[PDB]
Nucleic acid binder design. Structure first.
Lengths: 80, 80, 205, 85
RNA sequence: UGAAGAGUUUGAUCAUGGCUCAGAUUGAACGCUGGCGGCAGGCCUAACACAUGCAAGUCGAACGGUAACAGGAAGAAGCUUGCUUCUUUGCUGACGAGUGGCGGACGGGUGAGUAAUGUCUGGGAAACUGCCUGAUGGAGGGGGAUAACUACUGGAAACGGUAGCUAAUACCGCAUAACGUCGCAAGACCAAAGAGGGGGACCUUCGGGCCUCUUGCCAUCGGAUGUGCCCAGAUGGGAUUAGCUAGUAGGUGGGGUAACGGCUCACCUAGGCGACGAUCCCUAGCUGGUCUGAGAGGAUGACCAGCCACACUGGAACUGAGACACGGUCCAGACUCCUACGGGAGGCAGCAGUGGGGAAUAUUGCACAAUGGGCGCAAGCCUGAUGCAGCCAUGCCGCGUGUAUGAAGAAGGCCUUCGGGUUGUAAAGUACUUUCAGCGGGGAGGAAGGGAGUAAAGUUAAUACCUUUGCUCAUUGACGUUACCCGCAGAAGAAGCACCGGCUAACUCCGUGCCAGCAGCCGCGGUAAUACGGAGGGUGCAAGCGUUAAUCGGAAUUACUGGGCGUAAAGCGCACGCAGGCGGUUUGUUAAGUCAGAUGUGAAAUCCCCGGGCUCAACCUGGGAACUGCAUCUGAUACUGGC
């Protein structure tokens, strides 16, 4: 299915996430349809350390796309 | 808009087809020199108002047989 | 790796003091009584232009005690931001933590200041720092660590620093062992008796 | 013979015979319409088609021929049966 | 995101002309030598070949059952007379094996093949698909199977067979229904399964009614992503590889297939192809990229992403939504292993290790603790995926081997008619501070997510699942003797390599004696080579340094940026000329080329330019820029092209 998921980046110990719309078929790190922003689990001292287009998420929900629990916690991390 | 070319008949030896020559007539991208660059297509026509040496106008359409997708529109010079 | 070469023989070799064994005395100096040339000056050959570059390259690196590849990194960092490779290269060496500890007066030599960084006796932003190559940020506070703030050799370095002019780009309090690094080193108070028209011919190529 | 995959092989080999017997079963009904086209007889091929559609519709009900072949089996001959009917 | 210089033709000099050096990348390899950590890389070779083990399992919320563990019971007993190990009972939870469905086309691996209609940039129209998403619809009945299990049996074995018992979300008839199809219509076909969690009020042979939620089954077509078909542009070279094909060129028809089409059989016409290099061969996966240059360009496309082809040789079909199915099926060839001689079995280019090979590449490793994927709605299970350590300077980057003071300048060396110089403020002495290390102490973060209670007129039917900003708690560690800090002495335990007469920075002195030994050029050396070996001092770089291999930057010596042909590379001996290229002026016309405006396409990573994150950098990551073009739209209209 087409799903909204966290793509794994940042390499070792301090991971960094790119929030993408992708198909769950085959390859884990396969091709990705669209990016909607970035998420940092680590303190960055900036009030835009994490960035999301919540209206573009609502547009991809408007395509019937699946949501992942880690991205629901990211929508909570921008305080909805 | 659809793709259309002007060219000339180079063989009429078969009944329901004509062999048509088309050109690029453009500069070479690393020498500025004009290059004619001729390509041949096996064009469909069951009308038989044209023959070898006639200047002809052809259109891009669906495949009709193996490697054949271009068809006749009109005779451009009308020499006979 | 460490150079381990001589302290004052090199100062004499290029006719230019390196602040090595010479920063605090004028009498009883032990500087080999300012060595007259004897029969050596009459037997000194001329240096080549390739060697005149190398004499400058080594002098400018060794006065700050830095690594070659880091001095070359500063030559790439001085090329950007309309900084001039002949102008910001000096300010990049001068802006290292191992030289900020020296210009705050905590050590009477650069090696006695680098000692405090390498022994983790310094902190910046209240955090312990062991990196001598660290580039100190503007309006940030540098201080001696709690477990090192009683050193009489640092109180004695400050007893002498109270008699010196300070860089315009920083301040320091001799009581607190603490100072704000106000700005990156500036050409309005930064000057050196080095061949600034020659350091541009380096790494090219 | 290293991933203990042996049961899928017998389920596939059982399905081979079975799917071939599904095709054989409906091909026998098609064979009998083209034989009725050879019989030159009063509505005989239309009657042979009236018994064939429920055998191709069932063979399409789980897969096998349901993409376009069932819609061919229900249209490729429907003007020829109309003749001598 | 921007611009070289220097060694070198001689008795001189100036052209013309080739050679050379400082630099760099690497799955490198070798030798001297090697302190800490993190991050990356690590069998390219023999597409040769393996003993051993691992690597892919799983759901009881589809279920005939019960190999076990809890709890109850029964019982063989056990005895300690109130309970229990037993060891049986399938009851409840739950679950080994099987039935049933999914996963295995994920996870990965190799780069042999391929100059490819494959790949890359961009477009065309005609179809097919599971989960997902949307729309419109369906939920009746029967026949009996079939593992397991039970009793038999073919065989040396791999590997099965006979006869019976047994359930479903496994099988098959009959029924039922358009959105689907046949009959100009009346009419008719073709489907399937539920499972589990909770219950207020009310009734009850307290069995069910009735309420309800989450998640499933079937019907025939759209949407996304995916897959298939067509095409223009772009890709390495050689003709001392010149002829190619005739299933070939064009067409028609049958047969098959998801669409299209030579895909396939049969036939009709007579071609088609090559000069812009077909045919043939060599080398090579391609791209984002990697590295390098100011750039045009050059070399190279490991590891990481976006596609491909392949997995002992070759052919083939089937299974699934998807497989020309690498660990699936059949068959021969080769190779092998086993044999009870009757026959059989197998695939290290998944992770280790070994044999063979080679210049050369790790453990026959640790855990599943976090993350994705798989089964499962969730608990739980699996995972050489994933997390990590071990072994390897193979690369990147930071960082340790203390700081200060200490003399006509000691002991020891090297230079030295011997004046002095230099090792050297170095040492000894003294002061002074301990990072890293070692050892003991304390010890984070990676342990969230889920779960329990609490709260919510959550939605639903307010406390089934599930959701909720929060509060409160028991919990989960391979790495690990973690990071970080404390404590204890005590500078304590931590350094090489090549070179030093010119290009070429560092300076002498001794040995070798045209012999040995160096070299890129110079040439050296025939007993003052500071050119070969060593010593003292020094230079440079440093956990590296030198050497070799490949390929680049110097290179304006392949040429647009930015050359040559009288004498220094070369104008063809001459004329003619096919194929190809260029061509005076004026007024229109169409708007291809052109120019303008605008939109899409130009992946992530990577670079450049500008920032941010742990104490820095490595590493990670936000911004700006470009991807010159390609595709399409609407204008301009000089000039060329067409008219």
């Amino acid at each position: 299915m087409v799903t909204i998921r966290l793509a794994r980046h940042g390499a070792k110990k301090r991971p960094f996430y790119q929030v993408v719309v992708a198909d769950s078929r085959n390859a884990r790190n396969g091709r990705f349809i669209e990016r909607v922003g970035f998420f940092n689990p680590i303190a960055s001292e900036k009030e835009e350390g994490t960035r999301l287009d919540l209206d573009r998420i609502a547009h991809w929900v408007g395509q019937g796309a699946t949501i992942s629990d880690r991205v629901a916690a990211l929508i909570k991390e921008v305080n909805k | 808009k659809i793709r259309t070319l002007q060219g000339r008949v180079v063989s009429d030896k078969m009944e329901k087809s004509i062999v048509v020559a088309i050109e690029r007539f453009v500069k070479h991208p690393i020498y500025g020199k004009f290059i004619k660059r001729t390509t041949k297509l096996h064009v469909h026509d069951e009308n038989n108002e044209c023959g070898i040496g006639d200047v002809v106008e052809i259109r891009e359409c669906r495949p009709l047989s193996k490697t054949k997708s271009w068809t006749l529109v009109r005779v451009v010079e009308k020499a006979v | 790796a460490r150079y381990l070469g001589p302290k004052l023989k090199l100062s004499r070799r290029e006719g230019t003091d390196l602040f090595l064994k010479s920063g605090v005395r004028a009498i009883d100096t032990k500087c080999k009584i300012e060595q007259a040339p004897g029969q050596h000056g009459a037997r000194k050959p001329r240096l080549s232009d390739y060697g005149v570059q190398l004499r400058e390259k080594q002098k400018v690196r060794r006065i700050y005690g830095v690594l070659e590849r880091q001095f070359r990194n500063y030559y790439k960092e001085a090329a950007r931001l309309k900084g001039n490779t002949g102008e910001n290269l000096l300010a990049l060496l001068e802006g290292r933590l191992d030289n900020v500890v020296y210009r705050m007066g905590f050590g009477a030599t650069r090696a006695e200041a680098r000692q405090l960084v390498s022994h983790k006796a310094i902190m910046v932003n209240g955090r312990v720092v062991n990196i001598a190559s660290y580039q100190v940020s503007p309006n940030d506070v540098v201080s001696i660590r709690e477990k090192a703030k009683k050193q009489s050799r640092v109180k004695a370095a400050l007893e002498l620093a109270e008699q010196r002019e300070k860089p315009t780009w920083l301040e320091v309090d001799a009581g607190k062992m603490e100072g704000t690094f106000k700005r990156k080193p500036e050409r309005s108070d930064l000057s050196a008796d080095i061949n600034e028209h020659l350091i541009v011919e380096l790494y090219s190529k | 013979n290293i991933k203990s995959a042996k049961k899928r092989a017998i389920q596939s080999e059982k399905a081979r015979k079975h799917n071939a017997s599904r095709r054989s079963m409906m091909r026998t009904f098609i064979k009998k319409v083209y034989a009725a086209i050879e019989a030159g007889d009063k509505a005989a091929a239309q009657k042979a088609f009236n018994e064939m559609q429920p055998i191709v519709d069932r063979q399409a009900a789980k897969g096998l021929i349901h993409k376009n072949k069932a819609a061919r089996h229900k249209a490729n001959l429907t003007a020829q049966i109309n003749k001598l009917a």
